[PDB]
Amino acid sequence: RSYPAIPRIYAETTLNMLLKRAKKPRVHSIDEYLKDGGYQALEKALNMSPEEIIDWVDKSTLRGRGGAGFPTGKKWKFAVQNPGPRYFICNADESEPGTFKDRIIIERDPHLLIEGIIISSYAIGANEAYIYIRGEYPAGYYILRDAIEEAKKKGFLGKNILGSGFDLEIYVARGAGAYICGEETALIESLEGKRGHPRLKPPYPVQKGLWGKPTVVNNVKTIANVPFIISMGWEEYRYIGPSDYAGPKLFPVSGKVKKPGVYELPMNTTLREVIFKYAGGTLGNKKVKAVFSGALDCFSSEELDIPMDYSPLGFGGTGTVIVLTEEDDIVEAALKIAEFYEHETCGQCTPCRVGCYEQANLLEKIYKGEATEQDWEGFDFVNRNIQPTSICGLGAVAGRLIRQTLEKFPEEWEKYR
Amino acid sequence: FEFPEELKTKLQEHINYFPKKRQAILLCLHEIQNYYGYIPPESLKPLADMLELPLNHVEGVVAFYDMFDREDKAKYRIRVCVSIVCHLMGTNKLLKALENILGIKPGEVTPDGKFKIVPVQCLGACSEAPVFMVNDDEYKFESEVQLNEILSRYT
Numbered sequence A: 001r002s003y004p005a006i007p008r009i010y011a012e013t014t015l016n017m018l019l020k021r022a023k024k025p026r027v028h029s030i031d032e033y034l035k036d037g038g039y040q041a042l043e044k045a046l047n048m049s050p051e052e053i054i055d056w057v058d059k060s061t062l063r064g065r066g067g068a069g070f071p072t073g074k075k076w077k078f079a080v081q082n083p084g085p086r087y088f089i090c091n092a093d094e095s096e097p098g099t100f101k102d103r104i105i106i107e108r109d110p111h112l113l114i115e116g117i118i119i120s121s122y123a124i125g126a127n128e129a130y131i132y133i134r135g136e137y138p139a140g141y142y143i144l145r146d147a148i149e150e151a152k153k154k155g156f157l158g159k160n161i162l163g164s165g166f167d168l169e170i171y172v173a174r175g176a177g178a179y180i181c182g183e184e185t186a187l188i189e190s191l192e193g194k195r196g197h198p199r200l201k202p203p204y205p206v207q208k209g210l211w212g213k214p215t216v217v218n219n220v221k222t223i224a225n226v227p228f229i230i231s232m233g234w235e236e237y238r239y240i241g242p243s244d245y246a247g248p249k250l251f252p253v254s255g256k257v258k259k260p261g262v263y264e265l266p267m268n269t270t271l272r273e274v275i276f277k278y279a280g281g282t283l284g285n286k287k288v289k290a291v292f293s294g295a296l297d298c299f300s301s302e303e304l305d306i307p308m309d310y311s312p313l314g315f316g317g318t319g320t321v322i323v324l325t326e327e328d329d330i331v332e333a334a335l336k337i338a339e340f341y342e343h344e345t346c347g348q349c350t351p352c353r354v355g356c357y358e359q360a361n362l363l364e365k366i367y368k369g370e371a372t373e374q375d376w377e378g379f380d381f382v383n384r385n386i387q388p389t390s391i392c393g394l395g396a397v398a399g400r401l402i403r404q405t406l407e408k409f410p411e412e413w414e415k416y417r
Numbered sequence B: 001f002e003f004p005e006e007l008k009t010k011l012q013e014h015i016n017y018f019p020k021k022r023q024a025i026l027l028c029l030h031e032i033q034n035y036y037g038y039i040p041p042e043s044l045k046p047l048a049d050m051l052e053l054p055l056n057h058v059e060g061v062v063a064f065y066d067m068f069d070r071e072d073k074a075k076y077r078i079r080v081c082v083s084i085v086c087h088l089m090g091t092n093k094l095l096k097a098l099e100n101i102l103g104i105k106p107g108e109v110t111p112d113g114k115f116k117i118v119p120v121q122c123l124g125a126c127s128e129a130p131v132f133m134v135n136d137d138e139y140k141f142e143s144e145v146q147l148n149e150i151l152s153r154y155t
Ligand SMILES: Cc1cc2c(cc1C)N(C[C@H](O)[C@H](O)[C@H](O)COP(=O)(O)O)c1[nH]c(=O)[nH]c(=O)c1N2
Pocket: A063, A064, A065, A066, A067, A068, A069, A070, A091, A092, A093, A094, A095, A096, A179, A180, A181, A182, A183, A184, A185, A217, A218, A219, A220, A222, A223, A392, A393, A394
């Protein structure tokens, strides 16, 4: 089974859950998965009612790992309050800069994800599920297709799964270059065969989603926790890590570290610990200047002793860690972030459409040293006015990281003025 | 304009795969670009007919999704990440090596129609920065000598 070439992303875990198999950079097929007790959580789940499973996932305190942190139990509970048919969607779009964690589960332990999808689908009474995977992950696509056929052959998919009376097919859909299709509504829109334009909310997918029907969208990693919850029980699971943010967390670490990769750690871990204790410290042992929290936030070196939780003074985001050291030009880096939002705005809202473009266009002039005073004053203004009238999260955050760089590194920006 | 049967078979299978046929629009477009080296403009009308969609819907879709290219035919698309992490770790060195070897910059196609360099946003391999793809295959760039070996695999 020859698949496209993939780089071997380093992975390390102190919990040995989501990365139990995926810490090794190869495809774990069904026989090997079955040898680790794979699909036994599914068998257990099918002897429970859907309601019991919803309850177990609720009492586990599992929160969505896609960014928003929404409690998975309550989300499932909302969808089942509305009449069927109902749809389950696995969000595998992972297009945010610095994020490369979902792919390793997909490419190395697909059966973990599939098992999660089946349990989750049965829990909300969904007879059709979808994996929406970005088009720049072709190997993941092909690996998932083959894994699905394997599971089908073993009787874990199809009609009347293991005499349970439950029917499920999992369809795999591919993106074609659009960060915005990771937003749940725009994903459904793409799944319906249209442009990836986010829908006004409310209504939310759990009420009106795919074909206007109750739809649950969950992140790959959220789903991958479900087998563990069924297997261990809610009471044991909730005691993993800190109580406010329970469960294993995956931290993608990149940039100027000695050991860039995916790290499975508890959320009570510190930013300093991620970089130095796990990621092996900085390259050349240069001083850390800044940490870009993907394309969302910018933390300085005076802020490394903060937990990696969704606490007030926590790192938050999706725990994405891009390290910049002392020689790295952060206005050059800020430009790169600007350029991302420019290429990814869907264009529906005027301040986002125009603001994402102008932020990048003007910052390039500042970087190249050809900006006028009016270009500078205008960059500032554009940066604080991407948000208004916006109907999705991208517009609300397109200027956040850059604004923090202006506030936290004023001396470096003065150099360009 | 009519597709070859070979291609039409694959397109039909994607269309039969989903419960509704219009959900196969992206899989169909991928298949067309794979087969021709680009999306021919004249392909969209007959695709729209198979999907039971209006043409202008398909035009809007092709326009929206950046993987698809209607301008330039290329056997091998070298997608080079230009986002923040790869920038830090040496996108500019990769592009220079590509220029030294192939004689082309981002957005250009070699005169033989063999390779096109395509600048892309983060490819979700940031730990192995700087990252590039050659069609479906994906790699970290280490050096010009190493890149030259990899490119020699595509004939
Ligand atoms: C612009 C943008 C982009 C993304 C998102 C949001 C926005 C505004 N979301 C979040 C997504 O809409 C949704 O919250 C989650 O997928 C729900 O799953 P969980 O409850 O976290 O499991 C998101 N989620 C995800 O699973 N993968 C992704 O790549 C993205 N990308």
